[PDB]
DNA sequence: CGTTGCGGCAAAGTTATGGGTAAAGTCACACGTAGTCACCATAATGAAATAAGATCACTACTGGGCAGTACCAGACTCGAACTGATG
């Protein structure tokens, strides 16, 4: 499951406005690149698109240790 | 005439460069990045205070009028008496 968290991060989370990727090294965060001033998503839409990802994209995607979706 | 060195011609040989494809590596998922003094100008009262103003009290200076007094007649009114007409 933990690796699947990173799969979700790279496939769905890190491709969205407000992706708190820069904040890993806070020394490089500026008021122009702070995700807080860039946030656009809500809870409902983020949840529904994460569910769409989980139950269709990763659902039909082939797996290494499985040889099928 | 034959031999020998030299030079053109055209594959052939060697580097280089931008493409494609499987396969060895690479690295984040492991609860977490935002969070906190320092900074000096402006509004904004509320208090401190004003600088002049307001009034009291006293001192001195200078206009200035009222209750009362007084005379010299002119003029109207009328006691008191005189005098003439009369029934």
Please spell the DSSP secondary structure of A12-65, one letter per residue.
Answer: IITTSTT-TTGGGSGGG--TTT-GGGG----HHHHHHHHHHIIIIIHHHS--TT
Q: What values do phi and psi take at A38, rounded to 5?
A: -110, -5
Question: How far apart are the C-alpha atoms of A33 and A21, rounded to whole Å?
Answer: 10
Work out the widest C-alpha separation in chain A, in whole angstroms.
46
Task: Report CA(A48)–C1'(B7) in Å, whole number.
Answer: 82
Strand B CB-contacts below 7 Å: A 2-3, 5-6, 9, 20, 23-24, 26-27, 29, 34-36
Resolution of the model in angstroms: 3.7
Q: Give the whole-angstrom CA distance, residue A57 versus residue A4.
A: 13
Distance B32 C1' – A55 CA (angstroms)? 27
The set of long-range contacts for A10-15, using a CB threshold of 8 Å and a minimum separation of 24, is A11/A53, A11/A57, A11/A58, A12/A49, A12/A50, A12/A53, A12/A57
Residue with tokens 């490089």: A28
CA of A31 to C1' of B43 (A): 29
Experimental technique for the deposited model: cryo-EM
Contact positions of strand B to protein Cβ (< 7 A): 28-30, 32-35
């Amino acid at each position: 499951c933990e690796r699947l968290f990173g799969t979700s991060n790279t496939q769905f989370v890190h491709n969205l406005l407000g992706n708190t990727q820069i904040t890993r090294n806070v020394r490089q965060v500026t008021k122009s690149v702070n995700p807080k001033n860039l946030a656009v998503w809500t809870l409902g839409l983020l949840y529904e698109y994460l569910c769409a990802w989980a139950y269709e994209v990763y659902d039909t995607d082939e797996h290494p240790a499985l040889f099928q979706s």
